[PDB]
DNA sequence: CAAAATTTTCGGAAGGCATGCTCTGTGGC
DNA sequence: TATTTTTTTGCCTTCCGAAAATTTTG
RNA sequence: GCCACAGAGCA
């Protein structure tokens, strides 16, 4: 085991959180899936989940720690609704803004709609940014694209 | 969550770096240090003593002990070394020859190498070629040693150097000491060296006329402990023209001094168990290595007491000799010593002759799933089968691994049970490690539990490929492989087509039949070790398994022109052939 | 760097003695260990003659690796060697 | 959060596997080994993501497994400097705090220097207390939402002790570990802390 | 036996033992308290091996993350360090396979250091 | 084949082969095994008989070749996945 | 109680017992000031003699070509490393380096160094000239060769510049700064054969003289050119020019100067004898010695001959010629006979002289003339008389006794005087027995017997064995003991080595230890404020760590006090 | 063990080896001396060479360069007692597979 | 040129080595 | 304590004075 | 049980 590059591409949220419910829609692990047959059915045979328990704990906490809402007066996250479109869409318009890749990042990663927190992730806010480009970066943010 | 990614690769040898133990290297490897010559304590029912040659830390030799270092049994122990230092050190009898060699090359006043710069650069040049092997390194050591011993004074001191030899060459203590004759190559010159000589015994000769005759014979002893200290002092650029790589710490002349003695482990040197209850027989290795702590603690606190000169240098020549016989028996008479006769068996005796290691235990040794038995002869087998009897079958097992193309079969053999024939002796679950005996379970659980993973030992049934051996090998043909067939009379049974490969005859052989157990060496020896694929002997290319007596005779008598035979006799021959 | 392309293949298109052992032991050891076959086996349990029947008509999926002195190898389908 | 990792590894894949797809087989075998483990000085690995390049698979003279070596890249979870991520408190001490990412990695601890000035932690209601203003009464309570930023990434190694001081351990224990992988929070800037607190 | 022969002066109650140390007894008389000329030499060595570490001449041992964030300005450059290629050599003393690594046509500085004239060692 | 006519014998065998597991298993052990300790030299695992010894496979026979099992993965099959957040940002507008 | 092994390889020293005290040396000290790139190059080249920049990338591992240039580079500028280039017959060139010890003795000796050069000129009086000259010199050293031009380059003062220039001057004058050159990077041996295989050709063929004859001149003529090129570095060469304004003489600004290691091992040696000499006459005669010794100390012989290190002393003829060209030299050079009227002007003024001597039961010329008689009438030769009133330090006959005296008085130290006696009983005559030691050295036969075996473990007392047999056994033979003078020199001095190797070792890893917390000390705005700016546990450790840094450097210091004795 | 009195095995020697090598059957000549009489699980050092027990090496005090592998029990033998020997027979490992 | 140091030759002593496997019985600590 | 036999044969190299031969000094 | 010794089997 040697590693090539410990930093080979940049993963958002909803690439992760895609990529791993197709990865349960395949192996057949969705609570729809295992509502369906896996319990209180009998004619669980000749049809079963993909045997591996660790690989199906991380990504059952993975798929439940990016669909809940960390961002909130308190129920999605909102990446789980965003689609291909959306993240085109959005990444087009924080393209334009005067931000960095580890900004756009976490901006993507968290969506912020708390003003606090927009001043949490880009640093030096009041240096860079006057309050109009502020109202709009949270206005695009604001409907999640 | 918190488990690190554990990585396995497989790995092979890719060779070997012999070498000497340094002192740093026989400590690290230690576990205790051996600093009591008593066995055993009287006062704990005879248990192993405590820092003692029979120390627990070093392994167990019974199967009830413990070892206290990875705290396993006998079996799954695989032994630890102690260490124990001499007070005065030791030559050792296997460089003694490489220490007189370093010895004739070095001068004896500074050590430093008795070469030219221009010789050494150039007998470096050709040591360090690309293609230099074995002898050439040797012949250009031996041209270096040859300059070496040319050279009448050092280079960089003034000093006369003689020839450094044995004392005597025989087979005693003086076969262990190494003498400097400086004044042998001085002649009619007036050396400096000679004067301050003359000077000495002028002066010592006032006192003690008596030694004038010993005059003669006196010369520049190099003890063990002087050899030492003049290699301790031996430049690292000169170690390469001597044979040694100064590149590694484990390369210097001193390394080859006895300072630290690895006591070895005792699952090497076990405790054999006699028929008397009380008493153990110890190894010869043991015993030895009491006597060296022994003469090492008395050789110290004479030192520290102050014995009389004499006494201090025999002990010491009596550690040197009884270390000596610790490593070779054979290199010294036992008779010298004060305690002594049969030779004890040492580290050089255990390694060589057809009993040692090499040629008893690693070259040849002996198998598992082997059986002896007298041939007799059976023409109705086919000349790739042998006939083995049906006690030798269910003996000699075959592991199979159940699979979905056998599954039926082996729960059959399972339920057949050790006894009838067709059937198993010892099942190993897929998940377990010790297998079971099939005597005494159920026999039909265990055969509905069957898994998909399980290897059932079953036994020698029909069309098992079984190697047949003839033990005067003088050819490959001598040993081929067989296909089974079980027959009930207790003797093994070959064609008589097959018999002039093994160069046997039936009148009391016995041979030989091993059973592989992996499918690998089973294929192997079925394709190229085959009866029908040895038809041929490499020899000459040509047939060794053909007609023997009594059938080309049948064939000539058939085969002559005055044998006529009707349709009844015809038919009734090719029905007889087929 | 050290794979001789198929053009400029120059040891023999036999099959040996050896690589028949060789092939033969690896396949019934793989089917020993639950391996499927890729042949109508009639009734036949032992690995080995399934391995000889799988032979028989060439179809094992295995290459040989024939190393030359030097350091350059050399990949051989068995089903393209002539045994 | 997440990022991708570039590593080669050597699989060995089972004869009974041999009915399954290649593809299917190696990424088995990938997360056997790799999936929810800790690779040294990279971080958690969470699923492989796919493979680039496959050699051909070796086999090893006495056992029909294929040893395949497979260049893959993989979803390790990778907090970088200056990220900041929102957490679960699991269990607060005199030290620090301690904070779960929802049952991914419950080794997130906060101490006294990177948190809010002048809190303090009494031990009858178990929370750190922030004097902020008058209305003081502000809680670190455990099983709430709190917002931290990442701030020291922390490897230790996993060596193993002696045989013997193993063996007297464990006997002494029938009679807690550094963890591999641990990242420091810090809360020095506003709107960290509860997410409610900021609504 | 072996063990029935014994020397004069020893009895069968002090050998047998065989515990040689591992650590020595004899010590030189070096090992006296500082004197405060010795200290000054002493302040002088460490001085040296400073003056050396930091050097143009080292050659030593045999988090810088590719990420990019708005810190990196109001950040300053840790050292403009003098290398192996920044000194002038004299080139007569060298031999000509080494003139590929000094950079024979370079910009020339000359590392002088200053001399400490207290000595900073705290006690 | 060493330049010299050398002999089938413990002197001979001491010249052509320089391994050391091989001659000691055959006469002079512990002269051999003394002789490659004081000298250091290296003995590569090549030969028959310190294969035997240390029990790993011969390079003559059923040993010299490899058997590898072809894997059937074709390139198209190993195409890199989509990186949507590499490839969508850019930083054109800093700089 | 018992001690595992574990504890014996943690805490003790039986790892470094079997390192070279040569190669563990040279490779902690490079180790220690250069990286450890540096120390690889010097070790393997310590491992296995001269080495190409090819051979040195083939039996490193971890190092490429640039790489060993790069260090080759660093260890050439500090003088670590020699090197020779020669030319094959097919006409390939090769440059082989080698290591000297001069390079890594300058470094062992730095600030000894620095100490003797600020006591040596007399700038004991003042403060300034204490920092220009300390300044001066440990840029010297730490650059290896530096010229003057480029040093004034950094300074902007004009009378700073010419303050400096006069010190450089003066360093020059008296011999501690030389010229570096060639001759310094290339071994004494390849240039003795050089000059003796060129000599050899120049010898005309078919000539009338025999072989012998043809290599006694060759000898001659390569001894007389060997001698000139040796000692071209101290002709003065780079002082003679002046400079543009008259009345000031200045060093040549484009020439190269190095630290000249011989003058300062020459003062080592004025030390040492100084040392011995208030052991055996007074303190004021102690005094006058000292005065003697300084003033006749830049011409005196030089420590180690280098005719002796080209491999000439095969030949007992070339050893007698070695001896009495030494025996000339120490006498018959101009400036090292003296009178009493020369020490006369130099005397300080503390120094009275008046009431020292008694002659029955302010300078003057003969009150030192008295104590310079009392130097030549002592039992150590510290002075011999060629003419009377004329006085020479007799450098070849007193060495020796320095060394015996140094080695007795170690042994004594710690083995007991009780070694000393028993040693100097065994040399006085020459081989004795047991009975004759017992009955000339009285003291009891066990001591003896236990003494002289504690004196066999150190080389001191070598067992002569004579047998009374046809094999040799010890129990008829008779032994008796013989001191060797070399062996044990040797052994004592491998010895101090290795002690001070192991020294340097452990403050090596006792820095490698506390290297955060002295990082965290020696930063710029710490330092200074350390009471301040730290907690009062790492205020602690830093002062037991200075602690003993500072105890390591003394105890170096003393032991090379003591070991550079046997380096004569 | 020897006999059939102790139920022991019979010798596959020298001659048999040879002939075994005259076939060319490497896999066989393997089971039959390592796999069938004396196979042992062992640790070796990458670094040092020399062997260790449960997965840690005694001279070098760490567990980091322990590898498994498989020798016969004779080789394990010889190899101690050449360490009690005053020699060292350090053995040097690299990968089965090229990579 | 003949003494004298050096190199090569020539004997005699000293270790090392000598088929494979297999089966019993007896004796001594 | 001291009288006192061998119980295969052939081949081989290394060591080491002794002696012959050659070189080298004076 | 260990160690030697002795005999025997097959070319
Ligand atoms: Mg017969
Ligand atoms: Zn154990
Ligand atoms: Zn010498
Ligand atoms: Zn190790």
Same mark, same amino acid.
């Given at each position: ?145 | ?129 690309? !293609? ?57 010159? @007036? ?51 001597? !044979? ?24 090497? $040197? ?50 040197? %000799? ?49 059986? $002896? ?64 005996? %099939? ?23 029909? !069309? ?11 050819? $490959?043909? @001598? ?95 090719? @029905?007889?052939?087929? | ?83 | ?199 | ?123 | ?95 | 109680?018992?001690? =595992? ?115 040596? #000129? ?63 990077? =290339? ?7 050089? &000059? ?161 001597? &008694? ?39 007193? #060495? ?19 070694? #000393? ?94 290297? =955060? ?52 | ?18 002939? *075994? ?20 699980? *062992? ?57």
């Amino acid at each position: 085991m040697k590693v090539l590059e410990e930093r080979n591409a940049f993963l958002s949220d909803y690439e992760v959180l895609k990529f791993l419910t197709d990865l349960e829609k395949k192996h057949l692990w969705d609570q729809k899936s295992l509502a369906a047959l896996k319990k209180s059915r009998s004619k669980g045979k000749q049809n079963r989940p993909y045997n591996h328990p660790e690989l199906q704990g991380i990504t059952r906490n993975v798929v439940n720690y990016l669909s809940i809402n960390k961002n909130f007066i308190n129920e999605k996250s909102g990446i789980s609704k965003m689609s291909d479109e959306s993240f085109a869409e959005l990444m087009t318009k924080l393209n334009s803004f005067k931000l960095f890749k580890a900004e756009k990042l976490q901006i993507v990663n968290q969506l912020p709609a708390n003003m606090v927190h927009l001043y949490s992730i880009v640093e030096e806010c009041d240096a860079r940014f006057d309050e109009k480009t502020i109202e709009e970066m949270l206005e695009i943010i604001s409907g999640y694209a | 969550m918190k488990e690190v990614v554990v990585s396995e690769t497989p790995k092979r040898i890719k060779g070997l770096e012999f070498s000497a133990l340094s002192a740093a290297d026989i400590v690290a490897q230690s576990e205790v240090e051996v600093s009591t010559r008593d066995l055993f304590d009287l006062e704990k029912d005879r248990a192993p003593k405590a820092n003692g040659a029979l120390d627990p830390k070093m392994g167990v030799s019974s199967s009830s002990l413990e070892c206290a270092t990875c705290h396993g049994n006998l079996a799954s122990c695989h032994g630890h070394f102690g260490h124990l230092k001499l007070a005065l050190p030791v030559f050792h009898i296997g460089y003694f020859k490489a220490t007189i060699q370093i010895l004739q090359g070095i001068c004896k006043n500074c050590s430093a190498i008795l070469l030219s710069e221009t010789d050494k650069r150039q007998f470096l040049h050709e040591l360090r070629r690309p !293609g230099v092997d074995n002898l050439r390194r040797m012949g250009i050591l031996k041209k270096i040693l040859d300059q070496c011993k040319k050279q009448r004074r050092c280079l960089h001191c003034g000093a006369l150097n003689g020839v450094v030899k044995k004392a005597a060459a025989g087979a005693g203590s003086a076969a262990l000491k190494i003498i400097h004759d400086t004044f042998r190559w001085v002649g009619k010159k @007036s050396a400096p060296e000679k004067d301050i000589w003359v000077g000495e015994w002028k002066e010592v000769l006032a006192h003690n006329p008596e030694l004038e005759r010993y005059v003669k014979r006196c010369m520049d002893d190099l003890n063990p402990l002087k050899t030492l200290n003049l290699f301790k002092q031996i430049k690292s650029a000169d170690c390469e023209l001597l !044979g040694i790589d100064a590149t590694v710490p484990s390369g210097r002349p001193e390394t080859y001094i006895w300072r630290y003695l690895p006591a070895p482990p005792v699952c090497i $040197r076990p405790s054999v168990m006699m028929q008397d209850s009380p008493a153990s027989n110890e190894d010869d290795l043991t015993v030895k290595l009491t006597e060296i702590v022994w003469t090492s603690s008395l050789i110290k606190a004479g030192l520290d007491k102050g014995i009389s000169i004499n006494n201090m240098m025999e002990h010491w020549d009596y550690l040197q %000799l009884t270390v000596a016989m610790y490593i070779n028996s054979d290199s010294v008479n036992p008779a010298m010593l004060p305690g002594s006769v049969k030779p004890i068996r040492g580290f050089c005796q255990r390694l060589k002759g057809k009993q040692g290691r090499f040629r008893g235990n690693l070259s040849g040794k002996r198998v598992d799933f082997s059986g $002896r038995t007298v041939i007799s002869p059976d023409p109705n087998l086919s000349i790739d089968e042998v006939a083995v009897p049906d006690r030798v079958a269910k003996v000699l097992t075959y592991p199979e691994k159940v699979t979905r193309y056998n599954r039926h079969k082996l729960q059959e053999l399972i339920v057949n049970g050790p006894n009838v024939h067709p059937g198993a002796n010892y099942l190993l679950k897929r998940n377990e490690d010790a297998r079971r005996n %099939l005597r005494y379970g159920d026999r039909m659980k265990l055969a509905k539990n069957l898994q998909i993973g399980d290897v059932v030992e079953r036994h020698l049934e029909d !069309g098992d490929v079984v190697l047949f051996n003839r033990q005067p090998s003088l050819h $490959r043909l @001598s040993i081929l492989s067989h296909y089974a067939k079980i027959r009930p009379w207790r003797t093994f049974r070959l064609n008589e087509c097959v018999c002039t490969p093994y160069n046997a005859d039936f009148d009391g052989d016995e041979m030989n039949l091993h059973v592989p157990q992996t499918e690998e060496a089973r294929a192997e020896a079925i394709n190229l070790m085959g009866v029908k694929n040895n038809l041929l002997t490499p020899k000459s290319g040509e047939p060794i398994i053909a007609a023997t007596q009594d059938f080309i005779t049948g064939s000539y008598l058939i085969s002559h022109k005055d044998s006529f035979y009707d349709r009844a006799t015809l038919t009734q021959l090719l @029905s007889m052939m087929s | 760097e050290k794979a001789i392309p198929k053009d400029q293949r120059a040891t023999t298109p036999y099959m040996t003695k050896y690589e028949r052992a060789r092939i033969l032991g690896t396949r019934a050891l793989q089917i020993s260990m639950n391996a499927p076959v890729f042949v109508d086996l009639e009734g036949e349990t032992d690995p080995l003659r399934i391995a000889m029947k799988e032979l028989a008509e060439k179809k094992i999926p295995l290459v040989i690796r024939r190393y030359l002195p030097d350091g350059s190898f050399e990949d051989w389908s068995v089903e393209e060697l002539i045994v | 959060m997440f990022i991708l990792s570039k590593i080669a590894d050597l699989v060995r894949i089972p004869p009974d596997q041999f009915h399954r797809d290649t593809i299917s087989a190696i990424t088995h075998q990938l997360n056997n080994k790799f999936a929810n483990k800790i690779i040294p000085n990279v971080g958690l690995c969470i699923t492989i993501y796919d493979l680039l390049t496959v050699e051909e698979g070796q086999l090893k003279p006495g056992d029909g497994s294929s040893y395949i070596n497979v260049t893959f890249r993989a979803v390790v979870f990778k907090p970088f400097l200056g990220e900041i991520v929102t957490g679960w408190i699991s269990k607060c001490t005199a030290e620090g705090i301690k904070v779960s990412l929802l049952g991914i990695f419950d080794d997130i601890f906060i101490p006294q220097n990177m948190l809010f000035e002048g809190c303090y932690y009494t031990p009858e209601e178990s929370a750190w207390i922030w004097p902020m203003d008058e209305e003081t009464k502000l809680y670190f309570d455990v099983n709430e939402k709190i917002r931290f930023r990442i701030e020291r990434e922390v490897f230790v190694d996993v060596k193993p002790k002696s045989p013997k001081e193993r063996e007297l351990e464990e006997r002494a224990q029938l009679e807690e570990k550094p963890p591999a992988y641990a990242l420091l929070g810090s809360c020095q800037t506003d709107g960290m802390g509860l997410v409610s607190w900021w609504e | 036996n072996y063990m029935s022969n014994l020397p004069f002066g020893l009895g069968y109650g002090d050998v047998g033992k065989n515990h040689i140390t591992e650590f020595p007894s004899i010590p030189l008389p070096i090992n006296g308290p500082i004197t405060n000329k010795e200290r000054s030499l002493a302040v002088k060595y460490i001085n040296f091996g400073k003056t050396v570490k930091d050097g143009p001449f080292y050659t030593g041992s045999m988090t810088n993350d590719g990420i990019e964030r708005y810190s990196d300005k109001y950040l300053k450059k840790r050292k403009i360090g003098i290398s192996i290629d920044d000194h002038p050599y004299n080139l007569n003393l060298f031999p000509n396979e080494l003139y590929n690594v000094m950079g024979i046509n370079k910009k020339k500085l000359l590392a002088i250091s200053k001399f400490n004239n207290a000595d900073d060692v705290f006690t | 084949y060493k330049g010299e006519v050398l002999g089938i014998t413990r002197f001979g065998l001491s010249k052509m082969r320089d391994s050391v597991l091989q001659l000691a298993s055959f006469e002079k052990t512990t002269d051999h095994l003394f002789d490659a300790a004081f000298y250091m030299k290296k003995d590569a695992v090549e030969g028959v008989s310190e294969c035997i010894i240390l029990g790993q496979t011969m390079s003559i026979g059923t040993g010299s070749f490899k058997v590898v099992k072809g894997t059937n993965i074709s390139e198209k099959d190993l195409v890199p996945k989509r990186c949507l957040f590499e490839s969508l940002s850019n930083e054109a507008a800093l700089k | 109680k018992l001690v =595992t092994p574990e504890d014996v390889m943690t805490i003790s020293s039986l790892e470094q017992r079997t390192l070279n005290p040569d190669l563990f040396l040279y490779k902690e000290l490079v180790k220690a000031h250069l990286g450890e790139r540096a120390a690889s190059v010097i070790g393997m080249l310590v491992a296995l003699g001269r080495l190409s920049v090819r051979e040195l990338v083939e039996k490193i591992d971890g190092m490429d070509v640039d790489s060993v240039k790069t260090t080759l580079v660093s260890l050439t500028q500090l003088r670590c490393v020699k090197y020779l280039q020669e030319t094959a017959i097919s006409g390939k060139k090769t440059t082989y380096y080698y290591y000297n010890e001069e390079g890594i003795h300058i470094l062992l000796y730095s600030g000894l160094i620095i100490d003797e050069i600020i006591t040596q #000129m007399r700038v004991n009086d003042e403060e300034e000239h204490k920092q220009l000259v300390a300044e001066i010199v440990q840029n010297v050293i730490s650059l290896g060769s530096l010229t003057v031009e480029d040093y004034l380059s950094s300074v902007t003062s004009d009378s700073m510049k010419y303050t400096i220039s006069s010190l450089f001057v003066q360093l020059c004058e008296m011999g501690y700064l030389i010229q570096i050159s060639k001759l310094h990077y =290339t071994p004494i041996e390849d240039l003795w054969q050089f &000059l003796y295989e060129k000599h050899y050709k120049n010898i005309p063929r078919n000539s009338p003289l025999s072989d012998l004859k043809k290599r006694s001149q060759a000898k001659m003529n390569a001894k007389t050119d060997f001698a000139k090129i040796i000692n071209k570095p101290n002709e003065l060469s780079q002082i003679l020019t002046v400079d543009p304004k008259t009345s000031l003489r200045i060093v040549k600004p484009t020439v190269s100067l190095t630290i000249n290691l011989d003058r300062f091992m020459k003062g080592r040696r004025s030390k040492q004898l100084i040392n011995l000499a208030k052991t055996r006459v007074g303190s004021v005669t102690a005094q006058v010695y000292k005065i003697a010794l300084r003033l006749t100390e830049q011409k005196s012989p030089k420590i180690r001959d280098p005719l002796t290190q080209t491999g000439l002393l095969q030949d007992l003829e070339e050893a007698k010629s070695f001896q009495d060209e030494a025996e000339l030299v120490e006498e018959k050079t101009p400036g090292l006979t003296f009178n009493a009227i020369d020490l006369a002007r130099h005397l300080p003024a503390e120094l009275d002289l008046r009431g020292s001597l &008694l002659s029955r039961k302010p300078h003057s010329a003969s009150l030192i003339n008295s104590h310079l008689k009392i130097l030549a009438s002592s039992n150590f030769p510290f002075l011999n008389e060629t003419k009377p009133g004329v006085y020479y330090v007799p450098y070849s006959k007193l #060495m020796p006794v320095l060394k015996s005296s140094v080695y007795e008085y170690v042994i004594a130290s710690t083995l007991g005087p009780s070694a #000393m006696r028993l040693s100097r009983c065994i040399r006085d005559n020459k081989l004795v027995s047991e009975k004759i030691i017992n009955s000339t050295a009285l003291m009891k036969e066990k001591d003896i017997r236990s003494t002289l075996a504690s004196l066999i473990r150190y080389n001191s007392v070598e067992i002569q064995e004579v047998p009374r047999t046809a094999d040799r056994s010890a129990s008829r033979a008779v032994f008796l003991f013989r001191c060797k003078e070399t062996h044990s020199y040797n052994f004592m001095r491998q010895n101090l080595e290795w002690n001070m190797a192991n020294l340097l070792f452990k403050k090596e890893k006792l820095k490698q230890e506390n290297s =955060t917390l002295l990082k965290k000390a020696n930063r710029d705005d710490v330092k200074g404020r350390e009471n301040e700016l730290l907690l009062p546990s790492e205020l602690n450790q830093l002062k037991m760590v200075n602690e003993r840094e500072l105890n390591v450097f003394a105890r170096l210091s003393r032991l090379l006090s003591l070991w550079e004795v046997f380096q004569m | 063990t020897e006999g059939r009195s102790r139920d022991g095995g019979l010798r596959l020697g020298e001659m048999e080896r040879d002939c *075994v090598i005259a076939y060319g059957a490497s896999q066989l000549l393997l089971e039959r001396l390592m796999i069938s009489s004396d196979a042992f699980e *062992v640790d070796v050092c990458d670094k040092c060479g020399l062997m260790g027990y449960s997965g840690w090496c005694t001279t070098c005090k760490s567990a980091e360069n322990i590898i498994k592998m498989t020798i016969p029990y004779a080789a394990k033998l010889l190899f101690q007692e050449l360490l009690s020997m005053n020699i060292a027979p350090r053995l040097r490992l690299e990968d089965i597979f090229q990579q």
